[PDB]
Design a protein around this ligand. Sequence first.
Ligand code: HEM
Ligand SMILES: CN1C=C(N)C=CC1
Length: 291
Amino acid sequence: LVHVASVEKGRSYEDFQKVYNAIALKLREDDEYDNYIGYGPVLVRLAWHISGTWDKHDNTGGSYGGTYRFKKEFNDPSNAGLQNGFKFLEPIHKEFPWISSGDLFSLGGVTAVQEMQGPKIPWRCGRVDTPEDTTPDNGRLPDADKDAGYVRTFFQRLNMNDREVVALMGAHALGKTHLKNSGYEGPGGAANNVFTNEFYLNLLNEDWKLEKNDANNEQWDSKSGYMMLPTDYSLIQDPKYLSIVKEYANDQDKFFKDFSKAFEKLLENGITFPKDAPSPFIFKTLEEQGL
Ligand code: HEM
Ligand SMILES: CN1C=C(N)C=CC1
């Protein structure tokens, strides 16, 4: 199965910058969502979950086909709460009907990271909607109750190595867990709608206590009112992961650079870009455009 990127007919960088700008203006407007967090975090999670169904062994899933629009994937228990991000993007798709679903969902995540003062994430267009029968079955996204070995095995299905895993997990500074979505509750830190290396700092510097939550699941809780999933905490239990967590806690710039590469890789897994496709786009923030 090969998925060749095909540029939306006649569209260039400026067209996609307009879609980025619409997303970013709506992010700015809808600032009350989820007790004033805004939609940035859920859009990052959306872009990851539409990408994270990929299987390197047969090229099923991944961001290319935009299959999250189909009920089987939209209703995956692993995706509970992402309907909020889908609803946010609907008026954007209405304004730009020519964009593919996979391009829109992935661009949502890129826009969110940059508008939250994160690193620039290069982004490529050309994902093409595929039919309902190409929707991956549920069960391809990761469980949170597991250990470092599980995390490493899981991410190898996505061709991600240790550094890429640790860098991607830093997105868990953003937003929060919600008991009714996932059976976990709480934020990972204080700055949860600005992109920083706080996840790593908190892992290393907080006084964590293993507790059961109100859904009877184990999570690690700090006196500051932060939480970590067992899979997050595993990054300081595994010696290889711990070394990288320390690196990113010490150097936010290095974290930014590694996250940008890993996040682009995640969103492009499964896609063959023809050698004459456009170079990756780097979108200007609203601030950079005076908008
Ligand atoms: C071992 C891998 C991972 C596991 C087990 C995991 C698990 C979870 C869980 C259980 C939630 C809470 C969902 C809810 O209650 O609303 C969550 C939220 C989140 N996840 Fe992850 N995650 C993983 C990796 C990632 C990656 C790779 C990214 C993106 C780079 C990411 C980005 C986020 C974001 C931004 C949120 C907050 C969403 C919001 O505030 O609505 N996660 N994750
Ligand atoms: C520590 N974590 C924080 C989030 N916001 C989501 C998942 C885990």
